[PDB]
Design a binder for this molecule. Structure first.
Ligand SMILES: CC(C)CCC[C@@H](C)[C@H]1CC[C@H]2[C@@H]3CC=C4C[C@@H](OC(=O)CCC(=O)O)CC[C@]4(C)[C@H]3CC[C@]12C
Ligand SMILES: FC(F)(F)c1ccccc1-c1cc(C(F)(F)F)c2[nH]c(C3=NOC4(CCCCC4)C3)nc2c1
Ligand SMILES: CC(=O)N[C@@H]1[C@@H](O)[C@H](O)[C@@H](CO)O[C@H]1O
Lengths: 52, 47
């Protein structure tokens, strides 16, 4: 990560008063789980069925 | 299997929902939304 946009890297995550990341894992992880489940598995199988 | 089964009864349900949506839009002020608020004012003046 880069705190400033000088480098060709993704911007660093926001930090709190202490120098530790500020986002909550208990929100992000379920989000990614649901997204992967919907995209990788369900949608592709639905496409297979419609093609058939 | 489910897609093969429920295909015949899908367009009929969609036509029913289409009636619902069309009547919702017709039973409406039929004004573009970003100015529709004015109507809500003007109309509430009369009502
Ligand atoms: C219903 C279907 C589509 C989703 C099921 C997928 C599960 C694997 C997800 C659902 C709820 C998720 C959990 C909700 C909350 C947490 C706590 C989290 O731990 C923390 O990061 C806490 C951070 C802190 O303590 O500060 C780890 C993931 C976990 C078990 C998540 C991991 C993945 C879980 C079990
Ligand atoms: F084939 C398919 F469509 F997957 C599907 C097949 C069979 C039964 C249900 C679904 C379905 C339908 C919808 C809906 F039609 F209702 F949208 C879904 N929506 C979502 C998600 N919502 O938001 C997410 C993306 C944005 C971030 C949060 C997670 C995924 N997963 C769905 C699964
Ligand atoms: C005004 C500005 O952009 N300053 C940054 C500086 O903070 C950083 O240390 C350097 C290296 O990335 O690039 C530049």
């Amino acid at each position: 990560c880069t705190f400033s946009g000088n480098e060709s890297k993704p911007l660093c995550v926001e930090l709190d008063e202490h120098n530790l990341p500020r986002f909550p894992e208990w929100i992000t992880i379920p989000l990614v789980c649901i997204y992967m489940l919907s995209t990788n598995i369900l949608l592709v199988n639905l496409l297979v069925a419609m093609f058939g | 299997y489910t897609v093969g089964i429920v295909q015949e009864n899908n367009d009929q349900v969609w036509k029913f929902q289409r009636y619902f949506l069309v009547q919702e839009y017709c039973n409406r002020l039929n004004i573009p939304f970003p100015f529709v608020v004015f109507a809500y004012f003007y109309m509430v003046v009369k009502k």
